[PDB]
Amino acid sequence: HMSTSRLYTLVLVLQPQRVLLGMKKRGFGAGRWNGFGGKVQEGETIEDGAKRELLEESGLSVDTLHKVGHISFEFVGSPELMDVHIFSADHVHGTPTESEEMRPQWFQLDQIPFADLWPDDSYWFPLLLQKKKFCGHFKFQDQDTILSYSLREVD
Amino acid sequence: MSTSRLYTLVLVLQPQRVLLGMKKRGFGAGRWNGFGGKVQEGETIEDGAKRELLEESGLSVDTLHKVGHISFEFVGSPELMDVHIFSADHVHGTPTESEEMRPQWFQLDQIPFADLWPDDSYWFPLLLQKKKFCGHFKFQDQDTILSYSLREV
């Protein structure tokens, strides 16, 4: 009997010359920059989950999200398949605001600090920045080392 | 670091039947499947899919519809198999047995799932309902799935 896939959301506010990231202040991935998101709850849609996490973590509200990717992840030593649903936003309401969990900061699109993002980001950001959609899977040894991956555009 | 190896799979899916091939040798011998194989350097995925369909079944098509993307791994290897799945409806020629595949039509309510790869039981319903999908399956061995993700795109 099977180990369950667990669902997560990730939102990247991607405007014409900049992307909003947040420095994670505690918990899983603390000390790296990332988009906003977290676990999708039982009883909520993925997109409602994404909007909720963007609001709680950054203080931003959105009318529209655009779904851009689906990437699953696994780590050696864990039975859990992490199933991450990735969205973009452009127009937003509110001002980026520091939360308990995240400190938002804008980055120019040619000045993304990839050394301080999850390692996978370096592989799929190019598709994200080109407004493409994609599916993939990454197998990690640990927080720093990818063992293998699959990634391709969907169209 | 491994990158995944690319494969194609083509299901000739008509209103009340689907064409499968019994694999005669190699990896998956003795199971029914669609037609396909390794995508080669220097050909597109879709051209690879047409190529394998022709080589294995003698059928040629004009149009393939992209249906799904599924990655696969087996416990105890970093190798990832990356399968791009396509449908076809109209085909030219006569399904003929090759060295690799024995083609047969199945009515859609009579697909022999026990003799397909185990994952097919999970994604065939999406295929049948014309839904596009992405997924990943981790296999303990050729009969046993440990873990999977599968979602409409």
Ligand SMILES: Nc1nc(NC2CC2)cc(-c2cccc(Cl)c2Cl)n1
């Ligand atoms: N960019 C990126 N890459 C990731 N790579 C996976 C090896 C961890 C995971 C995540 C992510 C997304 C949503 C929620 C959570 Cl907790 C995380 Cl960690 N983000």
Ligand SMILES: Nc1nc(NC2CC2)cc(-c2cccc(Cl)c2Cl)n1
């Ligand atoms: N239906 C299905 N399911 C699969 N499940 C993976 C555990 C093996 C693999 C395949 C497949 C597709 C193209 C080429 C080859 Cl060699 C194979 Cl084996 N097909």
